[PDB]
Symmetry: none
Subunit: 50 residues, 2 copies
């Protein structure tokens, strides 16, 4: 199936990478939100304590 097959094997790889990308985006946005929340806690504490 040479060229047909090679195309279908690339479709499968692309789907695999797209899923990995989706996982990393979801995890990075969670980390980014938690960082900003931690940063806001730092400045809030410092405003009241330092």
């Amino acid at each position: 199936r040479d060229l047909e097959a090679a195309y279908n094997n690339l479709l499968r790889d692309k789907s695999a990478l797209e899923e990995e990308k989706r996982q990393l985006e979801q995890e990075n946005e969670d980390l980014a939100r938690r960082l900003e929340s931690s940063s806001e806690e730092v400045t809030r504490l410092r405003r009241g304590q330092c």
Copy 2:
């Protein structure tokens, strides 16, 4: 080029996805590091260390 063009478009997509995944992995590690630093600063502040 129907099949030939579709194949080459996928070659391009795969190459772009691999680079986006590496970028995302880099930013994942950077976010985790910054989040860990922030969390330690919150801990210091909560025990009175400005």
